[PDB]
Design an enzyme around this catalytic site. Structure first.
Site, short mmCIF file in Angstrom:
data_model
loop_
_atom_site.label_atom_id
_atom_site.label_comp_id
_atom_site.label_asym_id
_atom_site.label_seq_id
_atom_site.Cartn_x
_atom_site.Cartn_y
_atom_site.Cartn_z
N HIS B 42 0.81 -1.23 0.00
CA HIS B 42 0.00 0.00 0.00
C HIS B 42 0.85 1.29 0.00
O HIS B 42 0.34 2.40 -0.24
CB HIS B 42 -1.00 0.02 1.16
CG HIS B 42 -0.41 0.48 2.45
ND1 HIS B 42 0.03 -0.40 3.42
CD2 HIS B 42 -0.20 1.72 2.94
CE1 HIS B 42 0.50 0.29 4.45
NE2 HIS B 42 0.36 1.58 4.19
N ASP B 86 -0.57 -7.35 1.77
CA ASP B 86 0.04 -6.04 1.79
C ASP B 86 1.57 -6.14 1.94
O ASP B 86 2.16 -5.86 3.01
CB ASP B 86 -0.60 -5.18 2.90
CG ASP B 86 -0.23 -3.72 2.81
OD1 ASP B 86 0.29 -3.29 1.76
OD2 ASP B 86 -0.48 -3.00 3.78
N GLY B 181 2.97 7.07 8.77
CA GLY B 181 4.38 7.27 8.42
C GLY B 181 5.26 6.08 8.79
O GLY B 181 6.40 5.97 8.34
N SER B 183 3.98 2.88 8.42
CA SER B 183 3.55 1.81 7.53
C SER B 183 4.68 1.35 6.63
O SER B 183 5.48 2.18 6.18
CB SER B 183 2.38 2.26 6.66
OG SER B 183 1.33 2.73 7.49
C1 LIG Z 1 -10.62 1.26 5.53
S1 LIG Z 1 -10.37 0.13 4.18
O1 LIG Z 1 -9.40 0.75 3.33
O2 LIG Z 1 -11.65 -0.19 3.64
C2 LIG Z 1 -9.80 -1.46 4.79
C3 LIG Z 1 -10.36 -2.63 4.24
C4 LIG Z 1 -9.96 -3.91 4.69
C5 LIG Z 1 -8.99 -4.04 5.71
C6 LIG Z 1 -8.44 -2.87 6.26
C7 LIG Z 1 -8.83 -1.58 5.81
C8 LIG Z 1 -8.18 -0.40 6.46
C9 LIG Z 1 -8.71 0.08 7.70
C10 LIG Z 1 -8.15 1.19 8.36
C11 LIG Z 1 -7.03 1.82 7.76
N1 LIG Z 1 -6.47 2.94 8.43
C12 LIG Z 1 -7.26 4.05 8.94
C13 LIG Z 1 -6.24 5.19 8.95
C14 LIG Z 1 -4.91 4.45 9.24
N2 LIG Z 1 -3.77 5.11 8.63
S2 LIG Z 1 -2.36 5.34 9.40
O3 LIG Z 1 -1.55 5.82 8.32
O4 LIG Z 1 -2.58 6.12 10.57
C15 LIG Z 1 -1.81 3.80 9.99
C16 LIG Z 1 -1.81 3.59 11.44
C17 LIG Z 1 -1.41 2.33 12.11
C18 LIG Z 1 -1.64 2.05 13.46
C19 LIG Z 1 -1.10 0.77 13.79
C20 LIG Z 1 -0.50 0.19 12.64
CL1 LIG Z 1 0.26 -1.37 12.61
S3 LIG Z 1 -0.56 1.12 11.24
C21 LIG Z 1 -5.13 3.10 8.63
O5 LIG Z 1 -4.24 2.31 8.35
C22 LIG Z 1 -6.52 1.34 6.53
F1 LIG Z 1 -5.45 1.96 6.00
C23 LIG Z 1 -7.08 0.24 5.86
#
Ligand SMILES: CS(=O)(=O)c1ccccc1-c1ccc(N2CC[C@H](NS(=O)(=O)CCc3ccc(Cl)s3)C2=O)c(F)c1
Lengths: 54, 232
Positions: B42, B86, B181, B183
């Site tokens: 991603h 991923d 950041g 990830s």
């Molecule tokens: C929301 S989605 O894209 O439909 C989806 C679908 C299926 C499985 C997971 C997700 C999903 C759900 C939540 C997601 N989020 C919400 C915002 C967040 N972004 S971040 O850059 O703050 C990453 C934070 C982390 C905390 C702990 C870890 Cl490990 S990574 C994050 O990763 C995301 F990127 C993807």
């Protein structure tokens, strides 16, 4: 219950695999298995998985 | 990283940072060898052209070396809709020179890692990401011990499907998590003073929220894929 690789990682430094009911140890790339067949010795500098001291 | 501490000199030498055309970090990576970096699939959609920096603990000061990417190998099953698969491997144009703060993490064997590393109490996550959910990225490389979380408790905690290519780590309520950041970065597990790649920072519902955990790509599911990726 706890035998071979389930008993303290079979005394291996790294990978433990049970072959023919006996512990067999092995090491990540860049390490060689010592003569004792348990310890992993780095073949050169900056072996994987070690914090650096120099 | 929310909580945890600074990586002190030489403590997190497998950390890589994907940097945009503006020289800013947007994702992490793990050094696997002098030519290869492990990251999240991603992260390849978070910038067009990007480079890889290594040996940096303090981004504001000056070990550091920037490397151009020669080949991007993205897992062909990744999709944003599920976040499954991923994972991505980067081949660099020039070999990384190992030194203080620059060294690879070991790839474990699958069965051993699953029975022995993933059953340890904790793993270590690291990165230059945000220090709280809405703050700015850290100028200092940080690390955090994150407890492995039971698959069930994690599935119950999640609003999205935790596939078998994912695992959970972190805390129910404690204010310690990976964040934006971070990830793509390392999750490693220590065994007898040797650190092995166990996961890739993948996603979370915010950062450190209660009832919520960090979700990591399960590296053990991808060892053959990685091995293959590294041979070409
Ligand atoms: C929301 S989605 O894209 O439909 C989806 C679908 C299926 C499985 C997971 C997700 C999903 C759900 C939540 C997601 N989020 C919400 C915002 C967040 N972004 S971040 O850059 O703050 C990453 C934070 C982390 C905390 C702990 C870890 Cl490990 S990574 C994050 O990763 C995301 F990127 C993807």
């Amino acid at each position: 219950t706890r035998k071979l690789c389930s008993l303290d990682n079979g005394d291996c430094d790294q990978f433990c695999h049970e072959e023919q009911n006996s512990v067999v140890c092995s090491c990540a790339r860049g390490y060689t298995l010592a003569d004792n067949g348990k310890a992993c010795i780095p073949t050169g500098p900056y072996p994987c998985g070690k914090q650096t001291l120099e | 990283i929310v909580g945890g501490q600074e990586c002190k000199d030489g403590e997190c030498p497998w950390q890589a940072l994907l940097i945009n055309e503006e020289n800013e970090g947007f994702c992490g990576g793990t050094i696997l060898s002098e030519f290869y970096i492990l990251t999240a699939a991603h992260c390849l959609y978070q910038a067009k052209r990007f480079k890889v920096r290594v040996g940096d603990r303090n981004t504001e000061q000056e070990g550091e070396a920037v490397h151009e990417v020669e080949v991007v190998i993205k897992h062909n099953r990744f999709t944003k809709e599920t976040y499954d698969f991923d994972i991505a491997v980067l081949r660099l144009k020039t070999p990384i020179t190992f030194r203080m703060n620059v060294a690879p993490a070991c790839l474990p064997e699958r069965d051993w890692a699953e029975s022995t590393l993933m059953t340890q109490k904790t793993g270590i996550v690291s990165g230059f990401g945000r220090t709280h959910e809405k703050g700015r990225q850290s100028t200092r490389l940080k690390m955090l011990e994150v407890p492995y979380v039971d698959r069930n408790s994690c599935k119950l905690s999640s609003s999205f499907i935790i596939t078998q290519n994912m695992f959970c780590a972190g805390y129910d309520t404690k204010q310690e998590d990976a964040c934006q950041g971070d990830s793509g970065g390392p999750h490693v597990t220590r065994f007898k003073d040797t650190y092995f790649v166990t996961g890739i920072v993948s996603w979370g519902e915010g950062c450190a929220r209660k009832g919520k955990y960090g979700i990591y790509t399960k590296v053990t599911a991808f060892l053959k894929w990685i091995d293959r990726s590294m041979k070409t």
